[PDB]
Ligand SMILES: Nc1ncnc2c1ncn2[C@@H]1O[C@H](COP(=O)(O)OP(=O)(O)O)[C@@H](O)[C@H]1O
């Protein structure tokens with residue numbers, strides 16, 4: 574795998590632009606917030622981009638027409654945090670780990686791979702954490718990665 578230094582917010586922009594047309598067609602309200610424009614990490618850019626894509630795809634599918642999506646990025650000094658929130662029904666306790674299992678899906682033509690791929694990339698590849706909470710009238714997926722891979 575290739576690791577590079579890049580601005581994580583520029584990557585989020587790239588993912589927004591990828592989805593921009595779907596978001597418009599579905600009349601989804603998309604919101605973005607950051608506490609540091611210059612959110613630089615050393616990470617596997619293609620794979621982190623894939624995490625963002627998988628989460629944003631799930632958010633669109635969960636929120637549906639006229640829904641709402643918010644992405645927040647936060648500089649936490651030795652690590653960065655990205656949150657992808659959508660308005661929609663909550664995830665029950667009994668599924669909060671199961672949703673990350675390969676092939677688990679509640680969708681008719683679901684792969685059930687989006688989140689298992691996310692977990693592999695964030696946790697195994699980057700040494701980070703990914704989890705979900707129910708917040709407001711919706712669901713947030715949060716990941717954190719170190720700004721630089723942790724020296725052994
Ligand atoms: N934003 C979300 N809100 C509610 N449920 C979600 C969300 N994202 C994922 N899920 C649940 O996690 C399951 C697994 O997601 P994923 O691994 O991406 O597979 P797929 O999208 O193909 O079902 C989904 O089928 C859904 O039940």
Ligand SMILES: [Mg+2]
Nearest residue numbers: 627631687688
């Ligand atoms: Mg998915």
